[PDB]
Design a protein around this motif. Structure first.
Motif, PDB file in Angstrom:
ATOM      1  N   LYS A 258      -2.527  -0.733  -6.351  1.00  0.00           N
ATOM      2  CA  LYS A 258      -2.000  -1.007  -7.681  1.00  0.00           C
ATOM      3  C   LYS A 258      -1.939   0.260  -8.514  1.00  0.00           C
ATOM      4  O   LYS A 258      -0.872   0.675  -8.949  1.00  0.00           O
ATOM      5  CB  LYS A 258      -2.886  -2.021  -8.398  1.00  0.00           C
ATOM      6  N   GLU A 259      -3.098   0.870  -8.720  1.00  0.00           N
ATOM      7  CA  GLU A 259      -3.206   2.040  -9.585  1.00  0.00           C
ATOM      8  C   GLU A 259      -2.314   3.178  -9.094  1.00  0.00           C
ATOM      9  O   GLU A 259      -1.666   3.859  -9.893  1.00  0.00           O
ATOM     10  CB  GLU A 259      -4.660   2.506  -9.671  1.00  0.00           C
TER      11      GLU A 259
ATOM     12  N   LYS B  91       1.096   4.441 -11.115  1.00  0.00           N
ATOM     13  CA  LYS B  91       1.216   5.817 -11.573  1.00  0.00           C
ATOM     14  C   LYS B  91       2.390   6.519 -10.897  1.00  0.00           C
ATOM     15  O   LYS B  91       2.893   7.525 -11.397  1.00  0.00           O
ATOM     16  CB  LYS B  91      -0.087   6.597 -11.343  1.00  0.00           C
ATOM     17  N   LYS B  92       2.838   5.982  -9.766  1.00  0.00           N
ATOM     18  CA  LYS B  92       3.923   6.596  -9.020  1.00  0.00           C
ATOM     19  C   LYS B  92       5.251   5.903  -9.272  1.00  0.00           C
ATOM     20  O   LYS B  92       6.301   6.487  -9.051  1.00  0.00           O
ATOM     21  CB  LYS B  92       3.605   6.602  -7.531  1.00  0.00           C
TER      22      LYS B  92
ATOM     23  N   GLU C 234       8.917   9.270  -5.883  1.00  0.00           N
ATOM     24  CA  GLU C 234       7.524   9.457  -5.544  1.00  0.00           C
ATOM     25  C   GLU C 234       6.928   8.142  -5.049  1.00  0.00           C
ATOM     26  O   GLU C 234       6.209   8.105  -4.047  1.00  0.00           O
ATOM     27  CB  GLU C 234       6.792   9.977  -6.781  1.00  0.00           C
ATOM     28  N   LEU C 235       7.260   7.058  -5.741  1.00  0.00           N
ATOM     29  CA  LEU C 235       6.837   5.726  -5.330  1.00  0.00           C
ATOM     30  C   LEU C 235       7.422   5.378  -3.963  1.00  0.00           C
ATOM     31  O   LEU C 235       6.757   4.763  -3.133  1.00  0.00           O
ATOM     32  CB  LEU C 235       7.272   4.680  -6.358  1.00  0.00           C
TER      33      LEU C 235
ATOM     34  N   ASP D  39      -6.926   4.490   1.440  1.00  0.00           N
ATOM     35  CA  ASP D  39      -7.104   5.942   1.369  1.00  0.00           C
ATOM     36  C   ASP D  39      -5.767   6.668   1.466  1.00  0.00           C
ATOM     37  O   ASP D  39      -5.706   7.813   1.919  1.00  0.00           O
ATOM     38  CB  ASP D  39      -8.017   6.436   2.491  1.00  0.00           C
ATOM     39  N   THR D  40      -4.691   6.010   1.053  1.00  0.00           N
ATOM     40  CA  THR D  40      -3.389   6.652   1.049  1.00  0.00           C
ATOM     41  C   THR D  40      -3.366   7.746  -0.014  1.00  0.00           C
ATOM     42  O   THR D  40      -3.309   8.934   0.305  1.00  0.00           O
ATOM     43  CB  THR D  40      -2.253   5.643   0.799  1.00  0.00           C
ATOM     44  N   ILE D  41      -3.412   7.344  -1.277  1.00  0.00           N
ATOM     45  CA  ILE D  41      -3.579   8.284  -2.361  1.00  0.00           C
ATOM     46  C   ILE D  41      -4.969   8.146  -2.964  1.00  0.00           C
ATOM     47  O   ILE D  41      -5.869   8.923  -2.580  1.00  0.00           O
ATOM     48  CB  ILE D  41      -2.517   8.065  -3.446  1.00  0.00           C
TER      49      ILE D  41
END
Length: 122
Positions: free
Chosen positions: A78-79, A83-84, A90-91, A120-122
């Motif tokens: 989500k976060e 943000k992306k 970027e998303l 653990d992607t971003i």
């Protein structure tokens, strides 16, 4: 294919709110978006290549997890998403990475081993 999204029956017992469901919908929809590409759904295509294979995998994936880990996952996605999504491109890359990581499930990958990828992607 025959499918009526059976995951929604267990999703209900997980008690997810609008914040969680939107992320889960986003997740599932990006999978049906990117996994259709053999570069992203390498395991997907070679495991079946059916839209319902995603609807099965997400279910079996989350089923072997903890309810609070599902929250943990979605909150993370989500976060990062939120943000992306400020930047469509970027998303787009993020969505791509997410799917290419979930794709592992179609290759008899463990749900937690695949979960850590997404969380653990971003």
């Amino acid at each position: 294919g025959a499918m009526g999204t059976p995951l929604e029956k267990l999703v209900s017992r997980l008690n997810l709110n609008n914040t969680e469901k939107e992320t889960l919908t986003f997740l599932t929809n990006l999978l049906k978006e990117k996994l259709v590409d053999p570069n992203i759904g390498l395991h997907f295509k070679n495991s079946g290549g059916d839209e319902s294979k995603i609807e099965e995998s997400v279910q079996k994936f989350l089923s072997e997890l903890k309810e609070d880990e599902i929250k943990d996952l979605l909150a993370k996605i989500k976060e990062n998403k939120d943000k992306k999504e400020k930047d469509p491109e970027e998303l787009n890359t993020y969505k791509s990475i997410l799917a290419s990581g979930f794709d592992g499930i179609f290759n008899q990958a463990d749900s937690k081993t695949t979960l850590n990828k997404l969380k653990d992607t971003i």
